[PDB]
Structures are given as structure tokens and as C-alpha cells.
Amino acid sequence: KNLINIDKPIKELPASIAIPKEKPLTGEQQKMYDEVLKHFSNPDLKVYTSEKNKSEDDLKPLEEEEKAWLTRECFLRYLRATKWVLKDCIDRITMTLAWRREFGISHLGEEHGDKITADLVAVENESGKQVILGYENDARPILYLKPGRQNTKTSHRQVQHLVFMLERVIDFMPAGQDSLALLIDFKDYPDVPKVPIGVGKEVLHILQTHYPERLGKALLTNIPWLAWTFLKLIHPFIDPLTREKLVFDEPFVKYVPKNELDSLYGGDLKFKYNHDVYWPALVETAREKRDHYFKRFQSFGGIVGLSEVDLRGTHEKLLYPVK
Amino acid sequence: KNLINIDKPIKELPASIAIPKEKPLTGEQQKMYDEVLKHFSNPDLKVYTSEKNKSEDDLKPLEEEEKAWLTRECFLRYLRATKWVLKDCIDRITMTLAWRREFGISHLGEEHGDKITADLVAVENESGKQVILGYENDARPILYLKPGRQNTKTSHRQVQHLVFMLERVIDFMPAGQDSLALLIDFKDYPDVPKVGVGKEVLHILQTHYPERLGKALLTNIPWLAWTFLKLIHPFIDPLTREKLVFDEPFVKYVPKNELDSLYGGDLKFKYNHDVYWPALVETAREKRDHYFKRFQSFGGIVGLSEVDLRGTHEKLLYPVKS
């Protein structure tokens, strides 16, 4: 039958998928990067404790978990997102640090004090409306979004749930990659009892402001007829780089290995969502990844600027020693 | 209290809305335009009789009603849409002529032989899912699209209906304007009985109606869809996103006395098919009769200006270069 029955996240990137080569930095880009590193490596630096309630009178230094989040690639994502405008890059990183503090995820895990816990959001995922499973052609972990399986009413918890899953998919990043792939299925799921808007604006703000360069590819399917037409109509007018991220009306297998894809979309993975099995496995797997990540961070001096290639790897010597 | 009950299309652009003056052409654009004019003014020109069934062995000369469609502004719309690439402009105009013939609308009206008649598509508009009414700040006639009021099963007739309405809003273009404004309401309408096409509609819109979308005002957008629009919006080229309007008071773009009260305007409009449809069709018909009569009075030649065809002044504002 060729189908592979699976019910838990795939812990590692298979050796069959190579890690895409990283685009090189120009002498000047390398110079701006050093400026960002210097700024955040300042032992006296203090940052706002909140984004929404930002106050020049309430600043706090970088904690250890924050220094571990301020990585080489974190700097690069912001540098590229702000089009290498040093001042904007610094400001954005600072505001995301403030937001992570206000939102309750600045500690890199509930085990370090995060207010956003697995138990807090677990109910939101009981119908499997979001699933982390598999990796695509460019080694990007896959996040399935199935709005047609909505099981709860509009609430702020829905936002915390989304942020939690995004942070988890990020934990699943293999060494050498920092972008994810979203597979969005708009189909209606009647088997899922439907529950009987402010959240939209907060979701948008978070996605556009605090997760720069995370969208590697977006695979769309079962798009509503009318929505499809509007996408086709505006498509010729979307910036080249962005349009290349959008994939639709194409074989998903063309972008995702067959054994890494849900059979529901042409792959070989016979996946059925079972909460009492999938959720505990996801949380634990993510936990082990961050434990390793944080342990490496400490073994390398616990300083700002370390590379995620090194933090997520096991090689003895640093591939990217800090200047 | 300050509302106005209305149940039929507004026939003329009010004197209170000025027609935006057009930008003059550069010496180079002018040169290219003359090229288009020369090509389509060729007395020996023959063009395909169909787009989908295009055949080099089946070419027919331009009929009188087609020369009337090949206006100065028709050439310019295609020139602008093809980024002033002569070869592309000429090819596109030719395929649209071929498409209009195959689709059944190459005669400028059922009165001249159009296969697409008002009677043919009338039922598609019974629930008022599309309405032509009013003009906005830039004198663009307004076309309302209420997909939540769908009253029929999917079919090619729905396509014919859409094309018919587009051709009608074009008949409503005031002299000096050739772009329309679309007001789309995605709200669901339960009070309306419920129940490739999508691909055909896309092809027509993207290929045979260049530069017609002046403004697209959107409202009652679904939450999830709204998020995607906001997310991709920063990456849409400037000119295109300026055309899109949402999360803004429509009155900012449409005079209140030209806007449906459901969206903040003062027009209290209720769709009554037996009243609205006959008026729309007749008004459009009268506009087409005038347009064609003017065309004939000016020699019935290719290249005439829609400003002159839709106006009443005696002397031409845009004489055709001999």
C-alpha cells in the first residue's frame, strides 16, 4: 500500500535532505553585522520590559535566555528584513525582545519561567487544527494549518496557541536552516464540531513584526473559488521574491519529499491526529531540542552572537566563533 | 432622514463631479499610437473569427461596429497595459477582437446581432448580485458585486452575465473617463436562496479588459481572508495597491449622494428586478445608440475618440490623423 502510518512528529531531518547552502555576506553586510553584534553585546545594555506598554523608565538587562535567543542568524534575519538599515535592525530586535517579555515567552520554555505553557494552549490543538510534521525539499520543518478544523471560540488564547506552535516549529529547525514551510488547507472539516475579530489584528502584528524571514514557503490548497480568482488577479503584481514563496495549483510532492508529506495531499504519510499521543510527543521532542540548544549555549560561554548552526549541532568546535 | 430612495441606475454623471483631465502623450507615445492607428485603419486588414479556435485560414475584415469599438482610448488602454510595446499591443487588440466575436458581443448590442442578449442573462441578476449605480470622485461609474447573493447554479451563463454587466457599466462611462470602480461586499446573504467557470472568468478579466479597473473598494471581508490581504499587501506594486481600498470610509472615495446607504452613503437602494433591469438595459441602449450615431456622423472610421462619441459638441476634439 506504500502508506506509512505515523502519529507523532518526525524528530529529525533525514540524511536524504541536504541543508541549503547559506547566501554569503558581502564585505559591507559583514561590517553592519558586526555593528549589531557590538550593540547587543554591550554588558550595560538595558531593554524595555514591554512593547505595548513600552516605557523609557522601565528597562531591564538581558537575561541568559535572551542572550541565547540573540543569535548570529537572529541578527541576520532582522538585517535582511530591514533591508540592511542598521538603525531599523537594532530597533526591531529591541522591540521583539520587549514583546517576547510582555507576551510570556522570553525565557525559552516554560521550564525557564515562560508564562505560555503547553498545558495553557493544549486544548486549542485537540482537533489538530495545527500540526508540526515532516520537512520539505529545502529542509524546512512543515507546519500544517487547517482553519477548517477550528474547535474553540475567538479568544486571546488562540493567539498564544499560534505563537506557541510557531515557537515549536522553530525548535524543530534543523542545524543550518531557520525558515519554515506552511501548508494551509482551507477545506471545511464538518467532522469537526464548529463552535458557536481583534485576534486578527494581533495575529497580523505579531506575524509582520516579530517573526522576520521565517516564511520560507507557503503551500496553499482547497482554496475557495472566489478567493482563488482574487489571488490569480493580484498575483502578477506581487514582488518576485514573495510570489516565489507562494505555491498553489501544483503537486505538493514537487516541493516536499513523498515520505515527508501527508497522503492527504499526495504524500505517503497516513497521519491521523490523536491528541493524547501527538501532543505529548511534540512537547517532549521540542523540549529536548531546547535543552540541547541551551546547554550548548552555556558550554560556549553563554554569550550573544552564537550561531544556531553550532547551538543545534553536536560538533566539538565552533563553526562560527564570535568576534 | 437625509436619505434618497432610488431603484434605477443614475443615467448621467452629475455636474458636481468633474471629469479628470488626461495626461498628454509624449512625442514617442504619440508616434507609437499612430502606428496602432495605421495598422487598424488598413482597409485590407482581416482578423481571426475566434480566440479559442483561432485559425490563420479563417480571417474576416472589420465590421462597422468593430471600427466603432476601435477608438483612440481603446488603443491607449492597450498601449498602457502592454507597457508601450507596439507588437504586444497590436496582438492583444487583435485577440480581443477575435474573442468578442467568438463570445457573441462583437456587434455592440443585441440590436446589431449580439448573441449575448439582456433576455439571455436577465435571470442571473434577479437577486441583484450585481448592480450598476452611481459615480465616484473620479467620475468612474460604480459596479457593485455582492457574491453573497448568488442565486444560480454554476454555468457559462454566469460568465455571459458578468461580461454583459461589464459591457453595460462601460456604456455608462461618462465622456472623458474609461475606468470603472468596483465595490465588492463579501457579506453572506441568507435571505437569498442558495444554489472551468473560475478559469474562464480570470482569462477574460486579465486579457480582454485592460485598464478598466479604476478602483476596487472592499468591505465585509472575511477575517482570515483579511489577514492574508494585509500580509501580502506590503508586496503589491504601488500602482496596484493604490487601486485597492479597504478599512476606510467609502465616502472618502465616493460622494455620499452617489453611494449606497448600506455603506455610509445616502442612497437608500432596494433591488426590484422588474424595475431596475428594464431601466438599466434601456439606459445603456440609449447610450449605445448615441455612441454609434455619432460614430457614423463622423465618417464611421477607426480611431475616433470616446470623448467625441459620447459627447454632443459639433466639432471634433480629437480629429483622426488622415
Curated annotation (Swiss-Prot), chain A:
Catalytic reactions of this protein: a 1,2-diacyl-sn-glycero-3-phospho-(1D-myo-inositol)(in) = a 1,2-diacyl-sn-glycero-3-phospho-(1D-myo-inositol)(out)
Keyword Transport: yes
Natural source organism: Saccharomyces cerevisiae (strain ATCC 204508 / S288c)
Function summary: Has phosphatidylinositol transfer activity. Involved in the regulation of the phospholipid composition of plasma- and endomembranes. Altering plasma membrane composition may provide a possible mechanism for multidrug resistance. Involved in the regulation of sterol biosynthesis. Contributes to efficient phospholipase D1 activation in the regulation of phospholipid turnover. Regulates the release of fatty acids from lipid droplets.
InterPro entries: CRAL-TRIO_dom, CRAL-TRIO_dom_sf, CRAL/TRIO_N_dom, CRAL/TRIO_N_dom_sf, PI_Transfer_CRAL-TRIO
CRAL-TRIO domain segment(s): 120-273
Presence of keyword Transcription: no
Record-linked PANTHER family: GH16843P
GO cellular component, one term: cytosol
Protein name: Phosphatidylinositol transfer protein PDR16
Subcellular location per the Swiss-Prot or TrEMBL entry: Lipid droplet; Microsome membrane; Endoplasmic reticulum membrane
GO molecular function, one term: identical protein binding
Subunit: Homodimer. Apo-SFH3 forms a dimer through the hydrophobic interaction of gating helices. Binding of phosphatidylinositol leads to dissociation of the dimer into monomers in a reversible manner.
Superkingdom in the source lineage: Eukaryota
Source organism phylogeny: Eukaryota, Fungi, Dikarya, Ascomycota, Saccharomycotina
